[PDB]
């Protein structure tokens, strides 16, 4: 069975066993005074679903980001090849292949970072514009209070 398959299967067994070891019964024991067992269970069920689904989504992404499958397939291969031999310019181009893979990763990463940057800016703009409109009407409110102090003086 392939390495990449062995890993994925093990990583799923890890998660799935983690979840089995925080089961509802241990959750409910932490809150002895609660009588709506139903509410506690809905809460526990929403935890397990958030955690499990978010874990799987993140692990899928890291696996792609880090290019592990190709890598582990190459290892399987490198061991198949060795078995075959026990039975029975080039490394230039491989470096250049690896470097081009890297640049192309990097070009995708900086488009993303630069997008975050442009968005984070836009939020800084909007938050200072909001603080300024708040400033402008606080100023008007101070104006009224000072006129009011003058008006009090006439009595």
């Amino acid at each position: 069975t392939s390495r990449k398959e062995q890993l994925d299967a093990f990583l799923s067994r890890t998660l799935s066993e983690t979840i089995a070891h925080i089961p509802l019964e241990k959750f409910a024991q932490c809150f002895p005074s609660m009588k709506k067992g139903k509410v506690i269970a809905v809460i526990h069920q929403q935890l397990i679903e958030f955690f499990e689904k978010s874990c799987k989504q993140e692990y899928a992404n890291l696996i792609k980001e880090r290019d592990l499958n190709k890598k582990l397939d190459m290892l399987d291969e490198c061991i198949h090849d060795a078995e075959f031999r026990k039975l029975h310019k080039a490394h230039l181009y491989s470096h250049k292949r690896e470097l081009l893979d890297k640049l192309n990763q990097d070009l995708l990463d900086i488009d993303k970072e630069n997008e975050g940057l442009s968005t984070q800016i836009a939020a800084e703009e909007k938050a200072t514009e909001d603080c300024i409109s708040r400033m402008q009407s606080l100023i008007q409110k101070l104006e009224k209070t000072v006129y009011g102090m003058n008006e009090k003086n006439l009595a």
Binding site: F31, S33, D106, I121
Partner: protein, 214 residues
Amino acid sequence: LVELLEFTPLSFIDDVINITNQLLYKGVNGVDKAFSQTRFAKKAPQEIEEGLHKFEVLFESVVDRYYDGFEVYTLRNIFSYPPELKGYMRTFGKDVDYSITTEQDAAMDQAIQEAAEKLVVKMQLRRDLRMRLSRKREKKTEIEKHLERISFLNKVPENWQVTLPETTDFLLDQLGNLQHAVKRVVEASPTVHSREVDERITYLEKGYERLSNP
């Protein structure tokens, strides 16, 4: 091979465990928020905090044990090989059995010089953008500091002893000028320090210091 065996697994493992931990604490925080939607919140705050902390300690100890089990098995079983095959393992020729023409070796060289052009350009944009954002942050923080200062002036109470008309006209004149200065901040490029805004507020604070002089 040994890059793959000794180094490739590490950043993968670190990421998996680290994101698991983070998600466990987001999970726990979602649980705490959910409890605040229940009738049980008001009645039993200490029981809920302490139980949820006990459950967190357990959940963390479960993750630690199994994700360490996960770390071991990927380093020792997946990112490993039978060391008896060391001496049959190619002198590094997956690549070598396949001819690569001179045409293609210079073409790969072109596709590298081309993506190094794209990246240099994009890295200029990131620099320009990082500095823009550094400014807008400073400016936000500065303006919030100023907003807090006039808000404070708005929450001062008249502590009931006879205000002089020269001081109240001076406050009104400074408020007027502060409208203009705050208006200039919004319509123009952000500077390291909005000086006129800062000073007129300082005059306003001094005005109010004089009114409440003990």
